[PDB]
Amino acid sequence: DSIDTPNYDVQKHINKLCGMLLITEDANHKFTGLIGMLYAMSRLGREDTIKILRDAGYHVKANGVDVTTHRQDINGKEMKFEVLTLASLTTEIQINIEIESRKSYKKMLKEMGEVAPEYRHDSPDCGMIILCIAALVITKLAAGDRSGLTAVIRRANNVLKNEMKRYKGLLPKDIANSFYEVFEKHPHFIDVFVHFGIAQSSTKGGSRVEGIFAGLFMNAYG
């Protein structure tokens, strides 16, 4: 029925939401599967996402995704939070993700001073790092269970070694579980993910993380 169809205009915001989870020490990855799927949809854009969903036979009521402001007190001081209009993810859950991310960011500040771009929550490759785990999970979905979980974790520790040094919240077990859950609960995300992975993998050049993603995705075929 009602599905969030993020467009290109919110892609940066979703990438930062992925980044916020990636910098959180012992992050609660309950919504990471859904957030990574929202990121993949924002890369495809609303028109292509709806086309994929309808072509696959799904009944879709598209919910447009805008950025909005919510006010909330922190230490008795009013803070302004930018959130997305998502039918699948409440304002409260999004704000809690940011609050927990800010606590981990303060610990990083105390240890190393201001944080370098590649260790920040707004690094351009944050959404793609999350989708690297999804590429691994998609290879083990046919089993009808989570038996492939151990192999997912082993491959992620090897292939994503550099990204794990950058991010304390890059916990392959928890992120892989969140994707297994998102794909079991909402199988239409499998179609979306596969179309994303194909379109992503054919792109020329790009970042180191884009190359890692293309390698993992293509390894789910050969």
Ligand X SMILES: N[C@@H](Cc1ccccc1)C(=O)O
CA distances from 190 to 32, 56, 71, 94, 194 (A): 15, 11, 35, 24, 6
Strands (E), the chain: 2-4, 61-63, 67-74, 77-84
Q: How far is the CB of 83 from ligand X (least distance, A)?
A: 12
Please, which residue, 5 or 15, has the CB nearer to ligand X? 15
Q: Which two tokens stand for residue 43?
A: 């890369």
Stretch that binds ligand X, among 62-70, 73-81, 96-104, 196-204 (CB under 6 A): 96-104
Size of the site for ligand X (CB under 6 A): 6
Q: Which of 32, 94, 101, 123 is in the footprint of ligand X by CB under 6 A?
A: 101
Given the complex with ligand X, which of 13 and 121 has the nearer CB atom? 121
In the set 98, 125, 163, 210, which binds ligand X (CB under 6 A)? Answer: 98
How, if at all, do strands 67-74 and 77-84 pair? antiparallel
The answer to whether the beta carbons of residues 108 and 23 sit under 8 Å apart is yes
**Could you give the string, one character per residue 1-40, with x where binding to ligand X holds by CB under 6 A and - elsewhere?**
-------------------x--------------------
Please tell me whether residue 121 binds ligand X under the rule CB under 6 A.
yes
Question: Per residue in 64-83, is it b (16+ CB within 10 Å) or e — as a string?
Answer: ebeeeeeeeeeeeeeeeeeb
Instruction: Name the site residues for ligand X (rule: CB under 6 A).
Output: 20, 98, 101-102, 105, 121
